Design a protein around this ligand. Structure first.
Ligand SMILES: *[C@@H]1O[C@H](CO)[C@@H](O)[C@H](O)[C@H]1NC(C)=O
Ligand SMILES: *[C@@H]1O[C@H](CO)[C@@H](O)[C@H](O)[C@H]1NC(C)=O
Ligand SMILES: [Zn+2]
Lengths: 593, 195
């Protein structure tokens, strides 16, 4: 009875029971998300509870198979994921306190209101609508400081205790702290030179930031000059951007600054929604077009049970539904897409995005249950986003008859498009890096409690080039005012998945022998590109993510140079546009100073 | 003109579990095999040793009808020279098999909302089955070195596992009803001709 065979026998018993309990949990959850009734909440809770109860019990049996003694790395990975106790390593009382803490912060976030000089706005949609659309300095300031002084202040004492119990949980799971526990998602232990330590993620993420800083500084300088036009009495040409003028409640994306920053305001964006309606497209036509695109690159078509079981429109009966687009991998070769699709270019691109998740789910469906996931937390969205990249290009829209055969995209709308992309993609990278770096150092104890707000805004000025419009002491908890922080979600997933998606695109575009700028690339009708991609998709998480990445792009390394190549036409445009502007920022200046 | 009772095997309300597969001996009757091999209701009709069109022009001593239920991706295991959980531990065909293997999707009968769990299969066994061997024991499987003493526990497993058949499953996980027909030829009466 060798160690490999005992644990494989255990995994065989686990897999045969997990597939049923996980399916019943997914099916009940599906029946709620597509039929919102009080009856189906309880079924979803009971089905979810018996699946959670089962996994907890199997996780404790699984810990008796020491990883060191297993020769089989495929077996070793399965036991590893199953052995990860998480919050179950805490005492039952301490896990219940943390659950109460996490449920109170989440409740405070979604019920928080801000009352002006009785009528109060929630975040959704009141305070949001102001932060994404208002061009008035003082109205955005009232919403920005109001959200952080009413909601964030409530979260300050709860988040302090949230850190204690999370670090205690991670220490019980034999990690440095909660931050080092999160970085374990990128830990590869495999063959020679595919190794990836949790501490190496810190150096990669920091190194990638230094390579990005020049492009970000030029986008930052261009946005600063354009904001100086609209807020002439509040903006400094060499200072950080006021945190409340960035296009949303936190400045995560700069997308909503496009009306203030569009390089050529008379050039409209290419919107093919009218062409879709003019041709009597409906939601079945949309997902049929998405299916043909994946078949064009050599990926399989949808199963018949996909078309029967999916919810591709908002139901025409009276049942209430969650309309947020999701791709469901329920198990047992049951793949579905839940989507309240409308006949628009936006939902046309979303259909390719969600079906990209489906292709990924179908590819690794023959893997053992515990290995059916992305290589790491950033692979699934990276794969889904490159499909909408190809489908959104005018070349592809012309080839499916949605753009006129005459159509020629001029340079101005090409620059308009790249600028719009950079507000979302490039603008969010320093924000994402600095946020998770602050959480990593708060969990590690490098940032003491009495300097949380001091360090948060010292790193905002330093890394993001963003300054607070109002001085905040330690009664505030400003990061907690973001959904992902208040709801206990790791954030570096948005950093890495952005790096991955442009490595994938550049690799697949070279395989398709595309010629021209990378942003005009359409991988349609290239079977070798989809075949190259599938060699990674079918791996699941059965191999080190570095090896899975190398099977597509040829490199074991998370590389940002592909993203820089994608935005090189814009960087060339920005350096000329910023010729009379200051590139960089000083961390000293404050709008309140 | 005693007709062979194939409707009893093919149209039975219930089907047996694969680990306890059923066997019906067909003898002393006339079989019209064209009734079966000319039917489009069978997704699998694979013969070994014999040719379908020649079955009516043939005689055998006995004919055995084995029947059970497995999921779709396991029908390929019901064939000579296959490996897998079903072929090794539940139902094994000999390499020199003489007969036909018939299967058809039964999602409409054997699947149920919430899940049908009557059909079972043998998950563990110390050794492979010899051809046409039937194992219906329920002894606790000892996966380690400490004896189980008939107690489920660490490295000690109950050897049978249930299928879960929901009607929304993919085709590979849907239930399929299988009928294996064995044609035996001894130096003997040869009572089943069947024009
Ligand atoms: C929605 O759920 C109710 C029970 O909560 C059920 O009776 C009804 O049939 C469901 N409707 C649909 C269209 O599935
Ligand atoms: C690991 O186990 C699986 C299943 O037993 C097998 O397919 C694979 O070849 C094994 N790998 C090694 C290196 O033993
Ligand atoms: Zn997605």
């Amino acid at each position: 009875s060798t160690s490999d065979e005992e644990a494989k026998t255990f995994l065989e018993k686990f897999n045969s029971e997990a597939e049923e309990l996980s399916y019943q949990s997914s099916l009940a959850s599906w029946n709620y998300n597509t039929n919102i009734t009080d009856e189906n909440v309880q079924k979803m809770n009971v089905a979810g509870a018996k699946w959670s109860t089962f996994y907890e019990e199997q996780s404790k049996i699984a810990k008796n198979y020491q990883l060191q003694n297993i020769q089989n790395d495929t077996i070793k990975r399965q036991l590893q994921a199953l052995q990860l106790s998480g919050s179950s390593a805490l005492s039952a009382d301490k896990n219940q306190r943390l659950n109460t803490i996490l449920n109170t912060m989440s409740t405070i976030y979604s019920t928080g209101k801000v009352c002006n000089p009785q009528e109060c706005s929630l975040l959704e949609p009141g305070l949001d609508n102001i932060m994404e659309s208002s061009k008035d300095y003082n109205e955005r300031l009232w919403a920005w400081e109001g959200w952080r002084s009413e909601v964030g202040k409530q979260l300050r004492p709860l988040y302090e205790e949230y850190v204690v119990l999370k670090n205690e949980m991670a220490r019980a799971n034999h990690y440095e702290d909660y931050g080092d526990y999160w970085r374990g998602d990128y830990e590869a232990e495999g063959a020679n030179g595919y190794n990836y330590s949790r501490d190496h993620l810190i150096e990669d993420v920091e190194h990638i930031f230094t390579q990005i800083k020049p492009l970000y500084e030029h986008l930052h300088a261009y946005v600063r000059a354009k904001l100086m036009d609209n807020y002439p009495s509040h903006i400094s040409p060499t200072g950080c951007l006021p945190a409340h003028l960035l296009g949303d409640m936190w400045g995560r994306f700069w997308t909503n600054l496009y009306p203030l920053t569009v390089p050529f305001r008379q050039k409209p964006n290419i919107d093919v929604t009218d062409a879709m309606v003019n041709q009597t497209w409906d939601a079945n036509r949309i997902f049929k077009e998405a299916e043909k695109f994946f078949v064009s690159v050599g990926l399989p078509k949808m199963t018949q049970t996909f078309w029967e079981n999916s919810m591709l429109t908002e139901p025409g009966d009276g049942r209430k539904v969650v309309c947020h687009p999701t791709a469901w991998d329920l198990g047992k070769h049951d793949f579905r897409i839940k989507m309240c699709t409308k006949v628009t270019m936006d939902d046309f691109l979303t259909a390719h995005h969600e079906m990209g998740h489906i292709q990924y789910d179908m590819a690794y469906a023959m893997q053992p249950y515990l290995l059916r996931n992305g290589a790491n937390e950033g692979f699934h969205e990276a794969v889904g986003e490159i499909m909408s990249l190809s489908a959104a290009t005018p070349k592809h829209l012309k080839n499916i008859g949605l753009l006129p055969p005459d159509f020629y995209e001029d340079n101005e709308t090409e620059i308009n498009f790249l600028l719009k992309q950079a507000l979302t993609i490039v603008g969010t990278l320093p924000f994402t890096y600095m946020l998770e770096k602050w959480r990593w150092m708060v969990f590690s104890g490098q940032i003491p409690k009495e300097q949380w707000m001091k360090k948060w805004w010292e790193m905002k000025r330093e890394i993001v080039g963003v300054v607070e419009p109002v001085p905040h002491d330690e009664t505030y908890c400003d990061p907690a005012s973001l959904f992902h922080v208040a709801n206990d979600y790791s954030f570096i997933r948005y950093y890495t998945r952005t790096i991955y998606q442009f490595q994938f695109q550049e690799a697949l575009c070279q395989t398709a022998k595309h010629e021209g700028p990378l942003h005009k690339c359409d991988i349609s009708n290239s079977a070798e590109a989809g075949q190259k991609l599938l060699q990674m998709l079918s791996l699941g998480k059965s191999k080190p993510w570095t090896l899975a990445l190398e099977r597509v792009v040829g490199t074991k390394n998370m590389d940002v140079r592909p993203l820089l190549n994608y935005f090189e036409p814009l960087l060339t445009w920005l350096k000329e546009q910023n010729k009379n502007s200051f590139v960089g920022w000083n961390t000293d200046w404050s709008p309140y100073a | 003109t005693n007709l062979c009772p194939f409707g009893e095997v093919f149209n039975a309300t219930r089907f047996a579990s694969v680990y306890a597969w059923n066997r019906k001996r067909i003898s002393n009757c006339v079989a019209d095999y064209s009734v079966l091999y000319n039917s489009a209701s069978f997704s699998t009709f694979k013969c070994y040793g014999v040719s379908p069109t020649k079955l009516n022009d043939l005689c055998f001593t006995n004919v055995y009808a084995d029947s059970f239920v497995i999921r779709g991706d396991e029908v390929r295991q019901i064939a000579p020279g296959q490996t897998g959980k079903i072929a090794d531990y539940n139902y094994k065909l000999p390499d020199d098999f003489t007969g036909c293997v018939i299967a058809w999707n039964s999602n409409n009968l054997d699947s149920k909302v919430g899940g049908n769990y009557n059909y079972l299969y043998r998950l563990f066994r110390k050794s492979n089955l010899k051809p046409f061997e039937r194992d219906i024991s329920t002894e606790i499987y000892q996966a380690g070195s400490t004896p189980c003493n008939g107690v489920e526990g660490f490295n000690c497993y109950f050897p049978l596992q249930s299928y879960g058949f929901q009607p929304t499953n993919g085709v590979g996980y849907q239930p399929y009803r299988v009928v294996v027909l064995s044609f035996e030829l001894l130096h003997a009466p040869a009572t089943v001709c069947g024009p």
